[PDB]
Coordinates of C-alpha atoms in Angstrom, one line a residue:
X1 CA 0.0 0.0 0.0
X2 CA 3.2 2.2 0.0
X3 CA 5.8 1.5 -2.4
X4 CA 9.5 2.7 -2.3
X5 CA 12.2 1.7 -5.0
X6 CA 15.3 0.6 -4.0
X7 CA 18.3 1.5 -6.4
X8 CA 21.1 -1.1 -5.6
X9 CA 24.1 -2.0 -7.9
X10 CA 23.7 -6.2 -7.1
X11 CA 22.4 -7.1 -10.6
X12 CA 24.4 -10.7 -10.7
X13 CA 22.5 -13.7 -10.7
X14 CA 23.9 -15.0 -7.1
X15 CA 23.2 -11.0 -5.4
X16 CA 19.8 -11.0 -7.4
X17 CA 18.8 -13.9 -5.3
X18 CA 20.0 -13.0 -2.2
X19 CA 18.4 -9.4 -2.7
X20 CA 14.7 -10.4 -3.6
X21 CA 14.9 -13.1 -0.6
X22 CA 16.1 -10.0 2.1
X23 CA 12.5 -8.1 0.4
X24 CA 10.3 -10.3 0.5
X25 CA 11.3 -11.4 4.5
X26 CA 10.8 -7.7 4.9
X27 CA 7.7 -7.3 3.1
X28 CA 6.5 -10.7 4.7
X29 CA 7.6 -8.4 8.5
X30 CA 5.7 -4.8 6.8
X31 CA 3.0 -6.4 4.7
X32 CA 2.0 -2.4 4.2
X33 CA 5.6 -1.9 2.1
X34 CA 6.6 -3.0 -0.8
X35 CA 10.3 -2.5 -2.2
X36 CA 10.6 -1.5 -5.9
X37 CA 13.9 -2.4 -6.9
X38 CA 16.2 -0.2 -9.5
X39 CA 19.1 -3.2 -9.9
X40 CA 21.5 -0.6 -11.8
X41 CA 25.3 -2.1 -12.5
X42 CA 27.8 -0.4 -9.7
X43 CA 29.8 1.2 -13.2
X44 CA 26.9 2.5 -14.2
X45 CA 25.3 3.5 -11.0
X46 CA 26.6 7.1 -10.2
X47 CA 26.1 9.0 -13.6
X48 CA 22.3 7.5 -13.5
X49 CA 21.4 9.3 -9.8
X50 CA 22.8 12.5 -11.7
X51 CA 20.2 12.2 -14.5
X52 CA 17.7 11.2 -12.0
X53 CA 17.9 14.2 -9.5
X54 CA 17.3 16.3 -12.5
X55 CA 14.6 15.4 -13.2
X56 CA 13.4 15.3 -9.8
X57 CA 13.2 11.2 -10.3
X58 CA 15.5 10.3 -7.5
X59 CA 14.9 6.5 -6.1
X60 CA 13.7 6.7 -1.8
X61 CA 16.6 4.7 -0.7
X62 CA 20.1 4.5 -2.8
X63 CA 22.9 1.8 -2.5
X64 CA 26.0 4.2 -2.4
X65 CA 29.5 4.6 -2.1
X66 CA 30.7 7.2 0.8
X67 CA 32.6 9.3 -1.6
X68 CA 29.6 9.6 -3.8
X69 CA 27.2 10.1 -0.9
X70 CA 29.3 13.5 -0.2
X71 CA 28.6 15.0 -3.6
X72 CA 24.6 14.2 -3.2
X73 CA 24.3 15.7 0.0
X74 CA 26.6 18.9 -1.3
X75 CA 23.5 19.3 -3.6
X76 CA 21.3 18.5 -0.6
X77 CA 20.0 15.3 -1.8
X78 CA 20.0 13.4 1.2
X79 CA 17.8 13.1 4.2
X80 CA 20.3 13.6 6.9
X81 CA 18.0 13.3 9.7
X82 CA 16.2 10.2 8.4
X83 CA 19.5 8.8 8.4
X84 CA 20.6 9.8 11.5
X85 CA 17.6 8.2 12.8
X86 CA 18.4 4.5 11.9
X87 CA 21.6 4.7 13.0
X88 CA 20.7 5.7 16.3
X89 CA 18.1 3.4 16.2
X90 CA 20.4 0.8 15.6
X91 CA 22.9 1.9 18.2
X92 CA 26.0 4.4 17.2
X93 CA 27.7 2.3 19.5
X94 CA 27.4 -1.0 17.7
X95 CA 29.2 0.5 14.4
X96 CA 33.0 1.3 14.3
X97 CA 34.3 3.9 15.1
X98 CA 35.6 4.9 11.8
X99 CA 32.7 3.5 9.8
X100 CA 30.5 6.3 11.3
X101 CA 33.0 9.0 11.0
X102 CA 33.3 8.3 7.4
X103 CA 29.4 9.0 7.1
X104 CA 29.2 12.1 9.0
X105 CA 27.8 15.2 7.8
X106 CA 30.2 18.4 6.7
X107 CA 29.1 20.4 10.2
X108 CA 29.7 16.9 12.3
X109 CA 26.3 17.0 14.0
X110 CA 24.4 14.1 11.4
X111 CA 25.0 11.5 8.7
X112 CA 24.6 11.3 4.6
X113 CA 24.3 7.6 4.9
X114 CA 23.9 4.0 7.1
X115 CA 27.3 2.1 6.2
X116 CA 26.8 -1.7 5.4
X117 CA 30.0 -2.5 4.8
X118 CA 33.5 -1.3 4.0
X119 CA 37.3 -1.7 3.4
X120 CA 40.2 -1.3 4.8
X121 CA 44.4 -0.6 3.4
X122 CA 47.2 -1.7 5.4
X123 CA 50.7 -3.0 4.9
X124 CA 49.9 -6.9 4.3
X125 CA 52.5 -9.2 5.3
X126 CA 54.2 -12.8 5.1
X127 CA 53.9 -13.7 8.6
X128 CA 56.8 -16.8 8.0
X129 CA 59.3 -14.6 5.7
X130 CA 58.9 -11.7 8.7
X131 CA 59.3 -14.0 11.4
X132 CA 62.2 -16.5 9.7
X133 CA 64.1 -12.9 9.1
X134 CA 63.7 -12.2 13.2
X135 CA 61.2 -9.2 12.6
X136 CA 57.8 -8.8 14.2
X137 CA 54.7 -6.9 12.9
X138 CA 56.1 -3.7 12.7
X139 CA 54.5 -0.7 13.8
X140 CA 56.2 2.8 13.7
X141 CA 58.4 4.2 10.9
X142 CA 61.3 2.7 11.4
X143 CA 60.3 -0.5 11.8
X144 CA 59.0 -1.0 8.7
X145 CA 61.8 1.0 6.8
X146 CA 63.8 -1.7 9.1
X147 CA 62.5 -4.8 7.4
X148 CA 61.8 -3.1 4.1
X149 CA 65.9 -2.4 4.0
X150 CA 66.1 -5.8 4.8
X151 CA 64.4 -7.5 2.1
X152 CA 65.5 -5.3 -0.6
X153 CA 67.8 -7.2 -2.8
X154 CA 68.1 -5.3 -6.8
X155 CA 70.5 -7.2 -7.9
X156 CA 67.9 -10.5 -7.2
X157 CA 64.9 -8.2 -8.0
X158 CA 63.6 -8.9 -3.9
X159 CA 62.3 -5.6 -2.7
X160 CA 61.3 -4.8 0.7
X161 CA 57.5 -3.5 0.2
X162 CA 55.5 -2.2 -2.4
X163 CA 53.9 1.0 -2.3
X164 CA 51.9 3.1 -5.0
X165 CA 54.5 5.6 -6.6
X166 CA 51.8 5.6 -9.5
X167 CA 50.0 9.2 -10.1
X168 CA 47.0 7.9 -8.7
X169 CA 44.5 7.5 -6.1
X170 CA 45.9 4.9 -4.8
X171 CA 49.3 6.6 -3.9
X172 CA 47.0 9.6 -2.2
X173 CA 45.8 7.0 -0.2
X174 CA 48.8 4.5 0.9
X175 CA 50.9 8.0 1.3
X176 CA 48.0 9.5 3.4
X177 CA 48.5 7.0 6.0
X178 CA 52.1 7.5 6.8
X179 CA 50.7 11.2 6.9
X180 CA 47.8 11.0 9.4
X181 CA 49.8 8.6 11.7
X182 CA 52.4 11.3 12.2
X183 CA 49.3 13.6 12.4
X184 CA 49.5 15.5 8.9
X185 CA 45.9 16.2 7.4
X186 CA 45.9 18.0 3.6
X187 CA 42.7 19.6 5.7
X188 CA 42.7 21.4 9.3
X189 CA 38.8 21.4 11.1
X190 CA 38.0 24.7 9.2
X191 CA 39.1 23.6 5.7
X192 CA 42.1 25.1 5.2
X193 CA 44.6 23.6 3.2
X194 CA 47.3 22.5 5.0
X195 CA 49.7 20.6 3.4
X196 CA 53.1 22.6 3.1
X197 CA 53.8 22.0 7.0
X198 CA 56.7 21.0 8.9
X199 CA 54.2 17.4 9.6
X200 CA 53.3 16.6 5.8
X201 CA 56.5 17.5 5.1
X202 CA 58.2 14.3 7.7
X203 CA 55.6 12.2 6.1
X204 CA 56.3 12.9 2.7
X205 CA 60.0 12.9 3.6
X206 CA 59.6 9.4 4.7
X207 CA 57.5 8.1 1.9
X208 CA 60.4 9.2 -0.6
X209 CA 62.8 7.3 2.0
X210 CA 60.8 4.5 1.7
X211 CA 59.9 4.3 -1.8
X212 CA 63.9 3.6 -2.1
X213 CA 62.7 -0.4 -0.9
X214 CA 60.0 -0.6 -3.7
X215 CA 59.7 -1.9 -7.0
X216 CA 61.5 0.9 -9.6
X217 CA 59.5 2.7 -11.6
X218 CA 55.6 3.4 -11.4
X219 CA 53.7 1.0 -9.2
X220 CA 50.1 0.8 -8.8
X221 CA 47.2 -1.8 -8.3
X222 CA 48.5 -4.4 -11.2
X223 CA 52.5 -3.9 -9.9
X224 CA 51.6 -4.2 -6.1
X225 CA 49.2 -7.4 -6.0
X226 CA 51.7 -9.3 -8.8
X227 CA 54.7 -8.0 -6.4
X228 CA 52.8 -9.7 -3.2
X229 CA 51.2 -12.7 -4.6
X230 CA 54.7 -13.4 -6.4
X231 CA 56.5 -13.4 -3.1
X232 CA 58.6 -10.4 -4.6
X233 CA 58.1 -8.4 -1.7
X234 CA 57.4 -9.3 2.0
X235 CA 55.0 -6.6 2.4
X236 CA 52.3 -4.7 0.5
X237 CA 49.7 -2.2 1.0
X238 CA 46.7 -3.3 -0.8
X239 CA 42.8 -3.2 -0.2
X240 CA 41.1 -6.3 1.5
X241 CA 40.9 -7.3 -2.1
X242 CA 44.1 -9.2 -2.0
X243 CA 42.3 -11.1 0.5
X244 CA 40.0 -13.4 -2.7
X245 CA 43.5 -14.0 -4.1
X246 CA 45.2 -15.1 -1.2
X247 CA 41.8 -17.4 -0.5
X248 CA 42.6 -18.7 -4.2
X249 CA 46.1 -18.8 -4.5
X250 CA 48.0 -18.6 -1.5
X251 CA 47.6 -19.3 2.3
X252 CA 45.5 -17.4 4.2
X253 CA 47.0 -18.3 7.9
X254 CA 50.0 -16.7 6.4
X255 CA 48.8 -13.1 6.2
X256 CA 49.3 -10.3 8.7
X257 CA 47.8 -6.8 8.8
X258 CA 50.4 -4.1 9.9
X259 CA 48.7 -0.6 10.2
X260 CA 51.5 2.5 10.0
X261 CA 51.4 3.8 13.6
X262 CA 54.1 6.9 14.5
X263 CA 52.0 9.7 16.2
X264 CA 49.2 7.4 15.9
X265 CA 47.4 4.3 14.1
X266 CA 46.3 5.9 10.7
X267 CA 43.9 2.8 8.7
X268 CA 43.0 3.7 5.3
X269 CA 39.4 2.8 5.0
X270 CA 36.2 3.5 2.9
X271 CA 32.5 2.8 3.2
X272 CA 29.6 1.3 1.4
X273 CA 26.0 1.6 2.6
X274 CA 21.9 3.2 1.7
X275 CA 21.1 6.6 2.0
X276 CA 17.8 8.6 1.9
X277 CA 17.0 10.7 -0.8
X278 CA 15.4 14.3 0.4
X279 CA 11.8 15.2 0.1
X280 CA 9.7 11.9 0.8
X281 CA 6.4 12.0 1.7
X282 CA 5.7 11.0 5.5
X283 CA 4.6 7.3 4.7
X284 CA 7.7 6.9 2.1
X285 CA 10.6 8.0 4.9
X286 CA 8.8 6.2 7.3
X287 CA 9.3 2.9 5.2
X288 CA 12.2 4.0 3.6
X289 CA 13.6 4.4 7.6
X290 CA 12.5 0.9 8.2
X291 CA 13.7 -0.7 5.5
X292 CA 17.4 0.8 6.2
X293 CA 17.2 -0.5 9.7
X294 CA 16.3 -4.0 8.7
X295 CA 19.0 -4.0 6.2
X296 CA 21.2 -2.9 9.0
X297 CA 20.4 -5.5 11.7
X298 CA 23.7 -7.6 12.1
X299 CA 22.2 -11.0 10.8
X300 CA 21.7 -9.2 7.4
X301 CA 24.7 -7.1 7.7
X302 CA 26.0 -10.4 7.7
X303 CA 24.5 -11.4 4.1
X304 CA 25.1 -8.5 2.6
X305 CA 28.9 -8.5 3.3
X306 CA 29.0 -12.4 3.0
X307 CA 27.6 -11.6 -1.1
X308 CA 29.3 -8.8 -1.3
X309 CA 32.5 -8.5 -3.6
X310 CA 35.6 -10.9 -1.6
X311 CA 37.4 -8.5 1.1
X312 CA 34.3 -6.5 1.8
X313 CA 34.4 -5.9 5.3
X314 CA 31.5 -5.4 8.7
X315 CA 30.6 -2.0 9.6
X316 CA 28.7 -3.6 12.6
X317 CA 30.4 -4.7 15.7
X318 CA 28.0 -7.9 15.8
X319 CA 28.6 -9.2 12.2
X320 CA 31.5 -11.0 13.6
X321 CA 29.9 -12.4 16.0
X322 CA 26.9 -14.3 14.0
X323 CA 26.6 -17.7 13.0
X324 CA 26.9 -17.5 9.3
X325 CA 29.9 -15.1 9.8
X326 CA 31.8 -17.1 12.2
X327 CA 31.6 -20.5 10.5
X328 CA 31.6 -18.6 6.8
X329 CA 34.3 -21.4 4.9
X330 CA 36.5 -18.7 3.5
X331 CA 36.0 -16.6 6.8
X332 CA 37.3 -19.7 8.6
X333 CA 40.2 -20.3 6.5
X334 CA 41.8 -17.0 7.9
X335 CA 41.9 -17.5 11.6
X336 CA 41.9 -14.7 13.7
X337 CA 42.8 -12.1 11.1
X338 CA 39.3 -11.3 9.9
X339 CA 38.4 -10.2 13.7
X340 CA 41.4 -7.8 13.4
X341 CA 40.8 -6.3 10.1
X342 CA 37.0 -5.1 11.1
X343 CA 38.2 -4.0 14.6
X344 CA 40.8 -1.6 12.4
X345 CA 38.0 0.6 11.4
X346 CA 38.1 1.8 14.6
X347 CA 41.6 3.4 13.5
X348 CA 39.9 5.0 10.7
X349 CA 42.1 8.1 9.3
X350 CA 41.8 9.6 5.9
X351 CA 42.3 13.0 4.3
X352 CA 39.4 15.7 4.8
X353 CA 38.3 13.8 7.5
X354 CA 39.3 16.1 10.5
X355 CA 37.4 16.0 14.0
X356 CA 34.3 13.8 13.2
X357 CA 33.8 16.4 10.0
X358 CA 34.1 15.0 6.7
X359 CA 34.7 17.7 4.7
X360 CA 33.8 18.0 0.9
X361 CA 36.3 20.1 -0.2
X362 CA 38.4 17.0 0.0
X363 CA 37.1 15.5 -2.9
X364 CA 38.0 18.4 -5.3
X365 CA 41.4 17.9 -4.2
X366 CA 41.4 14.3 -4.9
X367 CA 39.7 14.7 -8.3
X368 CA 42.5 16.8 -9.5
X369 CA 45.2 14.2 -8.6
X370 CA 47.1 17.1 -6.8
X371 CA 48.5 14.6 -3.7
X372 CA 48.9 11.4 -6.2
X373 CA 51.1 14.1 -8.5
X374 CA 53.1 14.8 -5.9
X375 CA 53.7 11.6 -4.1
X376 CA 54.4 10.5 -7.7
X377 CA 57.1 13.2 -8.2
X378 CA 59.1 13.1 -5.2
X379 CA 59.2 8.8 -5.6
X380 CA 59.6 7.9 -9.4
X381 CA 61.0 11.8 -10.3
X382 CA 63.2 11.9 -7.6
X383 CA 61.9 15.4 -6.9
X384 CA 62.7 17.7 -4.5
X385 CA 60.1 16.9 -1.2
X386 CA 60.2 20.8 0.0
X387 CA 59.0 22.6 -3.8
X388 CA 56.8 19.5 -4.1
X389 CA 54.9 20.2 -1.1
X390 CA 54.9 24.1 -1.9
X391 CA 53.5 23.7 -5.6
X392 CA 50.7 20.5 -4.3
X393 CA 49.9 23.8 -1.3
X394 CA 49.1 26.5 -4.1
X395 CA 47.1 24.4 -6.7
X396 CA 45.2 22.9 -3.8
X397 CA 44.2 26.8 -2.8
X398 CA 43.3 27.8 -6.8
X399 CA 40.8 25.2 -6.7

């Protein structure tokens, strides 16, 4: 008797499945609501919403990614409060940490969206090459310069770790968390740009140090994963989504998760989930609300990251902790790492994300490549770190 569409990017056969069934229990719970799904492919997903709130068309509820979330609710697109509502219905408590913080509004005070799952970047390791070699997980700088010196061998082609030196996203991201763990934000809590200062500049510093233990030349996603899976390098920072390959191809009680800690821990992390389009009629937000929620409850949390692409990761503090979780066969097959990747998005740190306030001026400056340009100057140029950091500074005020 009240219909809201669901615009969700599983259109597979297998996701399809598991999709209706999670409706139709709801709509067997709400027999007053039924769900008109918009299956749209995850490629093709954003550009659609951007024709759709045009025309004033857009879908009640939206499968979205956090970064795209930001630019909706820039134009005001989102329901903040209805979002915050579910959330708080579920519990903020029961989410980590930094899975919330990713979703927080640009003032700090609401939400653009309910996370369902995410994933995390760290320095994944050989546990048996680190431990034969006398090294434990490192933590701080030095230790992991320490056993990257180590295994660095050019003559043998062995290097120590790979990193992105690639002008990409990527290196923005791997470089930012040597940056935020030594406390170095390319935002301050009022939007400034601050990125030519004496803390991004020890970060970036030490990313050029390190980068001299990494594969020569450009490295990105394809040069990283083949580096790691190859057993080129003891050490790699990389997604969860080595995690399918490693299932596949190599052993999964072999793998250790290493997070860059100096000033403090600094996880890499991003965040799927629904969001609430702006304007619904009372009846529509009200289903729309409830139909988030059920989604959210940690048994379907559960599905949803269980059928979700491999190394997708639990937003919920519970997921780990139910039944179809825990004795998941590939879940099982890693031990106790899975346990301590979700717990690491309560270390949550990424660019433009400064005191609970996720700001959207970030996302200009990651559009424009200006960080990946100049993490991929000072490593494959050679550059100079101090007129790097000035020039990255001014084009990052122009915008």
């Amino acid at each position: 008797e009240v219909t809201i569409e669901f615009m969700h990017s599983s259109v597979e056969k297998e996701r399809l499945d598991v999709i209706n069934k999670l409706i139709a229990d709801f709509e067997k719970e709400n027999p007053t609501i039924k769900i008109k799904q918009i299956p749209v492919e995850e490629d093709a997903f954003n550009t659609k919403v951007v024709t759709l709130a045009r025309s004033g068309k857009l879908p009640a509820v939206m499968e979205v990614s956090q970064d795209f979330a930001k630019v909706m609710d820039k134009d005001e697109l989102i329901d903040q409060d209805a979002v915050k509502e579910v959330i708080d219905s579920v519990g903020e408590d029961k989410y980590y940490e930094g899975a919330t913080n990713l979703v927080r509004s640009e003032d700090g005070k609401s939400y653009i969206a309910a996370p369902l799952s995410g994933w995390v970047q760290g320095i994944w390791y050989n546990k048996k090459a680190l431990a034969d070699a006398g090294f434990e997980e490192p933590k701080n700088w030095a230790d992991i310069e320490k056993v990257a010196k180590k295994f660095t061998n050019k003559a043998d082609k062995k290097y120590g770790i790979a990193i992105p030196t690639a002008e990409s996203t990527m290196s923005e991201q791997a470089f930012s968390q040597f940056a935020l763990s030594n406390k170095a934000n390319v935002l301050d809590a009022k939007g400034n740009v601050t990125i030519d200062t004496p803390e991004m500049k020890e970060a970036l510093q030490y990313y050029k140090d390190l980068s001299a233990y990494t594969m020569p030349g450009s490295n990105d996603v394809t040069e990283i994963k083949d580096a790691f899976m190859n057993g080129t390098v003891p050490m790699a920072m990389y997604s969860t989504y080595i995690l399918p390959s490693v299932y596949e191809e190599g052993d999964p009680k072999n793998i250790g998760f290493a997070i860059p800690e100096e000033k403090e821990k600094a996880v890499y992390g991003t965040v799927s989930g629904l969001t609430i389009s702006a304007g619904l009629d009372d009846e529509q937000k009200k289903a729309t609300k409830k139909f988030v929620e059920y989604l959210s409850q940690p048994e379907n949390m559960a599905t949803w990251v269980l059928m979700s692409p491999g190394g997708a990761q639990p937003v919920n503090k519970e997921v780990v902790e139910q039944k179809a979780y825990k004795e998941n066969e590939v879940i099982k097959s890693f031990g106790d790492l899975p346990n301590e990747i979700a717990a690491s998005f309560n270390d949550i740190q990424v660019f433009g994300l400064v005191d609970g306030k996720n700001l959207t001026k970030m996302g200009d400056i990651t559009s424009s490549g200006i960080i990946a340009q100049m993490v991929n100057n000072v490593t494959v140029g050679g550059g100079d770190v101090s007129a790097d950091l000035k020039a990255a500074q001014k084009k990052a005020e122009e915008g």
